[PDB]
């Protein structure tokens, strides 16, 4: 209880640093990062017991996942992969793993100040999304 209280909210996208070289790395096709570069989301984080959702709705697409913190699910990301994901709390962090045809990529979600920042990892290239409240 409480564990995820300061993620909980409507937060919108306000900079994005590197993120067509994140996507690159993933695998991600030329048009699909020209559109999906553009989108800023809508990440709307809320807790119920122990589960945790977090939907994330833009022009491009809108996502959602549901999750228990060490519990693996199946989750289908913007970019269409199909991606087996585990989500722990470390630190007071919230790290996300995202395993797909031996490959692997970890998203950090941090609260800093006001802002929600989200570090988007593949191998040696990071992206920073940092999200505001809404
Ligand atoms: O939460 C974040 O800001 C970023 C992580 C999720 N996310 N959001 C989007 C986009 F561009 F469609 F919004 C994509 C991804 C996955 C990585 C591949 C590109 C599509």
Sequence with gaps: SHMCDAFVGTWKLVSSENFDDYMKEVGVGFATRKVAGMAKPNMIISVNGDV????????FKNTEISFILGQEFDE???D??????????????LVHVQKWDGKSTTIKRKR??????????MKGVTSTRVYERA
């Design 52 to 59: 945790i959702t977090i939907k994330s709705e833009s022009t």
């Design 76 to 78: 289908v990301t913007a």
């Design 80 to 93: 269409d992969r199909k991606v087996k994901s585990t989500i722990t709390l470390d630190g007071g962090v």
């Design 112 to 121: 800093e100040d006001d802002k929600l920042v989200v570090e988007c990892v």
